[PDB]
């Protein structure tokens with residue numbers, strides 16, 4: 001813990017000339033990124049070399065586009081420091097203060113408080129999805145086409161060594177992908193990782209901030225409801241997403257649910273593909289095991 005911090009302190013002070021680190025601690029870890037709280041005031045997100053190049057470039061472009069075009073009281077990161085290179089990227093911004101939404105917290109809220117939070121979310125998503133995205137048009141994401149490409153990569157690498165059960169899970173997913181219509185609707189700018197661990201509450205349990213637009217892009221409108229609709233320990237629950245969808249309006253709820261159910265089915269495959277691309281056997285294994293867990297359930 002002590003050593004990472006020292007290296008990152010050095011790099012921050014090196015790349016940002018007059019920035020002085022008086023304190024620094026790890027506040028979070030993705031699987032190939034790390035976030036630090038610095039001087040109790042700044043978040044610094046960092047990343048070394050990864051399969052997905054230009055990641056922090058797009059993320060930065062999005063923050064800039066949003067800070068310029070959103071009219072909202074909800075805070076999002078506003079980038080003050082950035083360094084972007086193949087081998088190393090860093091984004092720094094002032095920490096948004098607040099408490100992350102969790103299921104526990106939600107359950108202590110009154111019905112009215114829950115309603116106002118749902119309205120706040122719906123409104124934010126309505127405003128973001130409504131933006132003219134011409135100026136960020138480079139940030140397009142085609143999930144269907146991405147999946148097809150990932151399937152081809154599988155075929156070119158490990159597919160032949162998979163078991164029949166594994167192959168059947170994959171082929172049955174591809175058949176569903178080919179039959180669905182859920183990619184043919186409205187495209188817009190989406191947060192695209194819109195889970196409750198990215199949502200911040202103020203002291204009245206109202207939505208005060210949103211973080212981690214690191215996967216954001218122009219993509220299906222349905223994308224931003226995938227976690228709101230999720231039934232799991234980490235998310236609030238399907239009814240929460242449903243109510244938010246009704247407040248948001250003008251969207252086919254059944255298709256939103258189909259979209260979520262398809263993304264969830266893909267997860268073990270997505271995991272395997274991550275392992276292949278990053279030469280991390282442990283992910284390949286975990287994804288394959290998960291296919292068995294899902295196959296044997298019910």
Ligand SMILES: Nc1nc2c(ncn2[C@@H]2O[C@H](COP(=O)(O)OP(=O)(O)NP(=O)(O)O)[C@@H](O)[C@H]2O)c(=O)[nH]1
Pocket residue numbers: 027028029030031032033034035043045047077094095096097098197211212213214215
């Ligand atoms: N309170 C607060 N916490 C933050 C803020 N920015 C980041 N964090 C904390 O740091 C964690 C990492 O932030 P995030 O942008 O989610 O990074 P990521 O998921 O790890 N990595 P990537 O986005 O590269 O996949 C968050 O889960 C959260 O705990 C902020 O502005 N305010």
Ligand SMILES: [Cl-]
Pocket residue numbers: 281284285288
């Ligand atoms: Cl394996």
Ligand SMILES: [Mg+2]
Pocket residue numbers: 198212
């Ligand atoms: Mg995150």
Ligand SMILES: [Mg+2]
Pocket residue numbers: 193212213214215
């Ligand atoms: Mg992220």
